[PDB]
């Protein structure tokens, strides 16, 4: 299925702080995310324009009386396009057990144990028989604040790389041009510095420096 999102970079930590402060009345939830990535040493998926990710996540306001495991989501993102602050990608995703996700980080060959349609599709589309030639590329931490604002769900990200923090606003929408205009009008009125995001979080990670 096609995932479509507005993607804007917040230019400073100060801009990000101003935004999260102003959006506090609209807060829905806060997610702590760890993103991990998988490819061959020869970058076979990356060269075929595919990204294979395991995301581990927890809701920051999870019940203290009723603990639950972190969630683990496997995703395949294919044929991405990112321009003019709009991201479009073919995406397949599935939830998997936390313990198996953790084991796949250390041993990518164990991705075959899951029996996921997502991973089945990786094998079928790109001509892999298994995940024996795969490594975990490592990954990074993201704090995602989610807001219900003017008919849309806003995601405000603080991505914490080894080389520094990056700040973004995202919005998953079937009407990206209309929604981008609405977000930008708000940011402009509030003087919150921004530009189009020209790189995915994974691309920034791989580059090893701030965009
Ligand atoms: Mg995104």
Numbering used by the authors: 0 to 210
Text taken from the publication that reported this structure:
The Vtc4p β-tunnel domain is not unique to eukaryotic polyP polymerases but is a structural hallmark of triphosphate tunnel metalloenzymes (TTMs), whose characteristic features are the presence of a topologically closed hydrophilic β-barrel, the preference for triphosphate-containing substrates, and for a divalent metal co-factor (PFAM families CYTH and VTC). Members of the ancient triphosphate tunnel metalloenzyme family can be found in all kingdoms of life. The observed substrate plasticity apparently allows TTM proteins to act on a wide array of enzyme substrates and to perform very different reactions, many of which likely remain to be discovered.
At pH 5.0 (form A) we find a triphosphate moiety bound in the AtTTM3 active site. Here, PPPi coordinates a Mg2+/Mn2+ ion that acts as a bridge between the substrate and the invariant Glu-169AtTTM3. The same metal co-factor coordination has been previously found in a Vtc4p AppNHp-Mn2+ complex. Here, the octahedral coordination of the Mg2+/Mn2+ ion is completed by an glutamate residue (Glu-169AtTTM3, Glu-160ygiF), which is invariant in all TTM proteins characterized thus far.
